[PDB]
Structure 1
C-alpha cells in the first residue's frame, strides 16, 4: 500500500517510496532484495480499456525486444499467476535520479552537458529508427537521467512501426506527440508515420536545453503552428509546393509574411555548432530535415561520434481491431517469462 492504493510488488521488492504519478499511474522506488539495489516500479491498470491495453502491450513488446544503453530496459514484470486474477501489471526498471523535465525546471546546463545529452538521445534514437520504429512522444519527461548524466529514453506506449507510404492526410486532423514537441506537418498533412517526426521533437528538446524554456510553447493545439512559424518564418514556395492538400496549402498562403528569427538572437550564448544542428533538426520541410545518422555525424557531436559504438537493432519490427480480452491475453503471454511459474 502506497498513498491509499495497493502497490503489490511481492516480497522481492520492499521499502517503497512514492516518486510520482506518470502517464500510466503510480511510480515508486523499491529495494530489490535479489540484486541489492533500489529500482523503479510503475503500476499499470489497463484492462478495462482497449486503448490502455494497446499502449501497455506496445511498450512491453518493444522494450523486451530492445537492448541499448540509452533506452530504458524492463528488468522484471510482476503480475498475478493467472489471467483471471491479473488486474494490474508492475514494470520494474533501473532507478534513475531524475528526468530532463525536472532537470530543466531548476538547472542551467553547460554546453558540455547539452552536447552529451544530445549525443545520447540521438544514439538511442539511431537504434530505435534502425528497428523501423518511431517513438512519437519524445520530450524532456521521457528522458531519464542518473547521477552521472547517463540518459535513457522511456515510454514506448505511443510508438509505431514506420510507414512513410501511408503518412499523408488532411489539414487539422492529427494528434501525434505532446503539443510543444509536435512537428508542423502534423497539423498540415502528416499522420506522424515517418522518422522525421522524432527528429523535430529532438530539435525542440535541444532548443529547450539551450534556454530552459520550451521553444514553441503553444497554449492549445491550434496555437502550436503560430509559434513554429513565428520563429521559422514563412515557408518557401518549394516547401509549400510539397503540401499538395489544398486546405493546408491555402491556410499557409493566407498568412502574412513572417521573417525567420535567427537562432543566434534567440540563443546568444549557444555554441554556433549547436545552432547549426538545431536549424537542421527544426527544418519545416520533413524531407529536408536531417536524419539521425547525419545528426550524429554533425561537427557539434565530434567529441563523441563513433559509428562502431552506435549500435543498430538486430531484428527490425496489429493491435487496433483486437478487443481488450484478447489484448489482456497477449499481455499475459508477453509477461510470462518473468514468472517463477
Structure 2
C-alpha cells in the first residue's frame, strides 16, 4: 500500500499513483490512477467509526449520493473498505476527479458574466433535483461546488443534509446552528431549524453575490455577527415581514434595532448584469415565505439562455440517525457499501 503524508491508502490494486489534494478532521483527499477505467480519480479516506456524529455524516453522504443520479451532483464511482465489519476501520469514497472547487477558484479568478450565469444555472439545476427528492442540502457554499476542467459544476458533501420538514421548522431565538456562517439564512438566528427548502436558496444567493465580486457578501465574524451583516445590507424588515415572526424574543430583537436603509444591489455590484441583481434580490429576500423557490429561479430572465424544464430532471422518488449508537451506524455503513464489493 502506498502512503500519502502519514496516511495509508489501502486502495489497491485498482488505484495507484497517489497525490495529496486536501485534508480534513477525519479525512484526507488524494488523486489516484484508476487502472480499470484508465483515468485519474479522486479518493477520500474517511475514518469515522470512533465518533457517532462522524458516523452520522458519513452515512448521510453515502446514502444520499448513492441514490441520486444527476449531472450537477457528484457521483460515487466506488467505495473501498475491508471485507468484514471487524476489519473495517476506514472507508474510501472514489469520485470523478474535479480540477477545483468554487472556493479555490474565487480566491484568484474573476468570473465572466457568462461563467456566473452558467455556474448559477448548474447550481440551481442540481438543487432542483435535490429539492425534488425532499432533501435539503443545508451546507451550500463555494467549497461544496466542484468544477472540472470544462467548468462542469457538481454539488458535493451531503453530510449535513436532512429530509425537508416545514411543519416542524419553527423554534426559538438564537438557538439554531445550520449551514456555514456566511451562507446561513437570517431566520436560522431568529426562529427556524433549517427544515425548509428556502434555507438552501438563501445560500445560493450568497454564492451568487460572491461570484459577482469574489468577496463574501455577509462576512460575519462570529455566529451573532451574521445577522448584523445581513440587516446592514437588506435594511430593516417590513412590518409585514415582522408580523410573520410570531416568536416574541425574535420579533422584539428586530424591533429594538434602529431603522436601517437598504443598500441597493447596483451600488454594491456596479459591474453586474441587472438581471443577475434582480435574481439576487429574490434569493436574498428576508422573509423565507417570499423568497424565490428553485424552479422560479431557473425560470428567471437571467438564466433564459439555459432554461429548459424538460432538461432539468427531478428525482424518481423522494426520501420520505441521532439516536443510533456508532456500532449500529457502522453496520449501516457496511451494508450501504456492500454493492461495491469486491
TM-score bin, normalised by smaller chain: over 0.9
Distance 2:24 2:234 in 1: 33
How far did residue 215 of structure 1 move?
Answer: 0.0
Distance 1:318 1:234 in 2: 38
Cα-to-partner distance string for 1:141-177 (whole Å, 9 max, x where unaligned)? 0000011110000000000000000000000000000
* Counterpart contact for 2:72–2:153, Cα < 8 Å: yes
Distance 2:320 2:329 in 1: 11
Cα-to-partner distance string for 1:277-301 (whole Å, 9 max, x where unaligned)? 0000000000000000000000000
Report the counterpart of residue 67 of structure 2 in structure 1: 65
C-alpha distance 71-238 of structure 1, shift in aligned 2 (>3 A)? same
Cα-to-partner distance string for 1:190-219 (whole Å, 9 max, x where unaligned)? 000000000000000000000000000000
* Counterpart contact for 1:78–1:89, Cα < 8 Å: yes
1:208 partner SS: helix
How far did residue 186 of structure 1 move?
Answer: 0.1
* Counterpart contact for 1:76–1:91, Cα < 8 Å: yes
* Counterpart contact for 2:27–2:46, Cα < 8 Å: yes
Bigger drift between 311-320 and 39-48 goes to: 311-320
Cα-to-partner distance string for 1:31-55 (whole Å, 9 max, x where unaligned)? 0000000000001000011111011
TM (norm. structure 2) is 0.99
C-alpha distance 207-91 of structure 1, shift in aligned 2 (>3 A)? same
How far did residue 21 of structure 1 move?
Answer: 1.2
Equivalent in 86, 89, 92 of residue 90 of structure 1: 92
Structure 1: which 5+ runs fail to align? none
Cα-to-partner distance string for 1:10-41 (whole Å, 9 max, x where unaligned)? 21000000001146510000000000000000
* Counterpart contact for 1:81–1:339, Cα < 8 Å: yes
2:229 partner SS: helix
Distance 1:22 1:167 in 2: 31
* Counterpart contact for 1:96–1:147, Cα < 8 Å: yes
Report the counterpart of residue 264 of structure 1 in structure 2: 266
Distance 1:124 1:23 in 2: 27
* Counterpart contact for 2:46–2:90, Cα < 8 Å: yes
Distance 2:110 2:24 in 1: 24
Runs of 4+ in 1 over 2 A off after TM superposition: none
* Counterpart contact for 1:24–1:42, Cα < 8 Å: no
Equivalent in 327, 330, 337 of residue 329 of structure 2: 327
Distance 1:224 1:23 in 2: 25
Cα-to-partner distance string for 1:102-125 (whole Å, 9 max, x where unaligned)? 000000000000000000000000
Structure 2: which 5+ runs fail to align? none
How far did residue 318 of structure 1 move?
Answer: 11
* Counterpart contact for 1:58–1:157, Cα < 8 Å: yes
1:222 partner SS: helix
Distance 1:194 1:298 in 2: 21
* Counterpart contact for 2:134–2:320, Cα < 8 Å: no
* Counterpart contact for 2:144–2:155, Cα < 8 Å: yes
C-alpha distance 187-67 of structure 1, shift in aligned 2 (>3 A)? same
Distance 2:208 2:320 in 1: 33
Distance 1:318 1:107 in 2: 41
2:4 partner SS: coil
TM (norm. structure 1) is 0.99
Bigger drift between 24-33 and 224-233 goes to: 24-33
2:83 partner SS: coil
Aligned-pair RMSD on alpha carbons? 0.8
Cα-to-partner distance string for 1:241-277 (whole Å, 9 max, x where unaligned)? 1111111000000000000000000000000000000
Cα-to-partner distance string for 1:68-108 (whole Å, 9 max, x where unaligned)? 00000000000000000000000000000000000000000
Report the counterpart of residue 233 of structure 1 in structure 2: 235
How many residue pairs align between the two structures? 340
Cα-to-partner distance string for 1:312-341 (whole Å, 9 max, x where unaligned)? 00010091111111110000000000002x
2:223 partner SS: coil
Distance 2:317 2:248 in 1: 40
1:38 partner SS: strand
- Note if 1:161 corresponds to 2:163: yes
How far did residue 5 of structure 1 move?
Answer: 1.9
